[model samples]
Target chain A: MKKRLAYAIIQFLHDQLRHGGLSSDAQESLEVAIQCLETAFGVTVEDSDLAL
Target chain B: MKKRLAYAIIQFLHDQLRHGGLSSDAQESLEVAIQCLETAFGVTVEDSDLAL
Candidate 1:
């Protein structure tokens, strides 16, 4: 489920970003995005980069 | 781990794209989105709409 979920999220982000041309940095953006989100919420996401 | 992730993503997109005054086709748009992503990565997504 971890890898599957990461892959799904990458898909979801790609969609939201690409549709409006809002995501130029989609590839490596997930790591940073998750990091910033964690910082903001003070919650760490396990398997944040479960991309394989 | 399942629906929580989906809801989180939907929330994320709603935030990012909403701030830009983008289009309001968040539904069909999301459909096409995951499709494009699956195509790009040669993957497929399955969610029974998993509705209420």
Candidate 2:
């Protein structure tokens, strides 16, 4: 696990929550989460992230 | 698409954000995301969370 990248997640979550409430969005949040993982690691979250 | 699960992702993100900053942890966050997807769907995040 890239420790620094993991730590970045903490900051990312903070910024996200500080600005927007959790219930602010679902599809967007799911998409962002997928992006985060993809950028940090290197894999697709779904066939696309919201494969519905 | 299980709209409820998608919505649950929102709530889940909220709880995660409210309880801890994104910077709090990456591996755990990554793991949590995987769990979220698995419980909500059934796909593995990395054949497991950290595949590298």
Candidate 3:
């Protein structure tokens, strides 16, 4: 469940990167967030089935 | 950095719970997401200074 949540957030952050109209700093912030979530949860954006 | 990212995400999820116009399922999903982040990152919403 934790890993699924992390994957979902990572996916959300990736969508935000492309379409969320984020400022440059916010974009970088979310990119780092994605990396952190991936490392911490042992999940990746590629784990689409894991996204909640 | 990882913990900070998790804190930020948790904070974001909390805000969503209050004002994101989420459906009930989404609200529960985000609530659980916040819990997952807190446990995984060893930080809580009370750790406001850790938010990104």
Assign candidate 1 its CAPRI class: incorrect
Best by lDDT: 3
* Best-matching candidate per TM-score: 3
In candidate 2 chain A, what residue range of length 10 has the lowest lDDT sum? A43-52
Measured over the true interface residues after superposition, the C-alpha RMSD of each candidate is 12.3, 9.7, 10.7
When summed lDDT is taken over every stretch of 10 residues in candidate 2 chain B, the lowest stretch is B43-52
Question: Over the stretch A1-52, how does candidate 1's per-residue lDDT look in tens digits?
Answer: 1345445565454444345333344433433444333323333443355322
Residue B38 displacement in candidate 1 (angstroms): 16
RMSD of 1: 13.4
lDDT of 2 by residue, B1-52 (tens): 4445444444444444456454544445554454443333323323422332
> All models: lDDT?
0.40, 0.44, 0.58
TM-score of each: 0.26, 0.30, 0.48
How good is the docking of model 3, as DockQ? 0.07
lDDT score, residue B10, model 1? 46
